[PDB]
Ligand binder design. Structure first.
Ligand SMILES: [Cl-]
Ligand SMILES: [Cl-]
Ligand SMILES: [Cu+2]
Ligand SMILES: [Cu+2]
Ligand SMILES: [Fe+3]
Ligand SMILES: [Fe+3]
Lengths: 157, 159
C-alpha cells in the first residue's frame, strides 16, 4: 500500500526514507488529522545505519526525533507545513501524519509534482540522554538538518 | 564490563523486561540525571519486543516512550526510594536509566544488602505515542499499566 517518495538519503548515522499510503486512523484521537479529512498518510522511515555514531543498533528505529515537514506543489507553488508524529503501525514504529491533499480546504494540493522537505532535530531536544563516559559513551548528535525529496502525487491511493 | 543482572528477566505483554545495574555513568545533557560523582550505580530497564509482539514492534526492537517508575527497597534496613528511569542511549543501544546514590545516600540505609526492585510500567500512549487502528495497517491495543518485581543482592559499585 506504500508509495515511495523520491530516493532515500543516508546521513548522520541514519537511513531516511519517505512514503505515502492511504489515510489511517490513529489513537489517541484528537492529534492526527482524521482519516475522512485526509487523502494520504505521509511517513518518515528513519533507521540506524551500520556503525551509527550515537549507539543505535543497525536497523533500529530512531526515536524521539523532532520532525517537521514542508510539502510544496511545484506546479501551483502551493506550500503547506506540519509535524510528523511518532506512532506504531503493523510495519512498526515511524513518524507520520494524515494530510489533506485534494481535500485541503485551501486548494492547490491535487495531482502533480511535489517537493517534500523534512526538518529534523536530534533527540536531546526532547530530553533523551546519551552516555558520555569512556566505557559506554557515544558521540555528539547532529545539528538540525533538512532532507529533500521530489515526487509525483498521483492521487489519493 | 558487562553489567550486573538484577534477578531474572520477565516476559510479559509482548516484551522482555530485564533489569541491570552498572557503575555510575556520565550523561548529557548535564542536569537531568544525578551526577556520576554523587551516585553509586546506574540502574537500567532493558525492554525489547518479543516475537509476535501484539503492538506492531518487530522482535528485538527497543520499546520506546514507556513511562517507567522504579521503587528500590532494601529489605534488610527498610530503606525505600522511588524515581523514574529516563530514556537514553549508550554504546550498546537505547534503554531506560538513572544514576542512583546507594552508599552515598546518607538519608537512608541504602548500603550493600538484599533488595526488592519494582518497575511500574505504562504504555507509550501515556506520552502521546500513537497507534494505527484501521483494519489495513492497525495493531493491537496496548497493555494496561503493570508492575514487575525483582530480587537481588547489591554488592556495591562494580569495580
Ligand atoms: Cl529525491
Ligand atoms: Cl527476580
Ligand atoms: Cu502513521
Ligand atoms: Cu543510561
Ligand atoms: Fe510504513
Ligand atoms: Fe545497558
Amino acid at each position: 500500500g506504500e508509495v515511495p517518495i523520491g530516493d532515500p538519503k543516508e546521513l548522520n548515522g541514519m537511513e531516511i526514507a519517505a512514503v505515502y499510503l492511504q489515510p489511517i486512523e490513529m489513537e489517541p484521537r484528537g492529534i492526527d488529522l482524521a482519516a475522512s479529512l485526509a487523502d494520504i498518510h505521509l511517513e518518515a522511515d528513519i533507521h540506524a545505519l551500520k556503525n551509527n555514531p550515537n549507539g543505535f543498533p543497525e536497523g533500529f528505529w530512531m526515536p524521539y526525533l523532532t520532525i517537521a515537514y514542508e510539502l510544496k506543489n511545484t506546479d501551483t507553488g502551493a506550500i503547506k507545513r506540519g509535524t510528523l508524529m511518532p506512532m506504531v503501525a503493523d510495519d512498526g514504529p515511524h513518524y507520520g501524519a494524515n494530510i489533506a491533499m485534494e481535500k485541503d480546504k485551501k486548494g492547490g494540493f491535487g495531482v502533480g509534482n511535489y517537493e517534500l522537505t523534512f526538518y529534523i532535530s536530534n533527540p536531546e531536544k526532547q530530553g533523551f540522554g546519551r552516555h558520555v563516559d569512556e566505557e559506554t559513551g557515544v558521540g555528539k548528535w547532529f545539528e538540525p538538518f533538512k532532507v529533500d525529496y521530489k515526487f509525483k502525487y498521483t492521487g489519493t491511493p
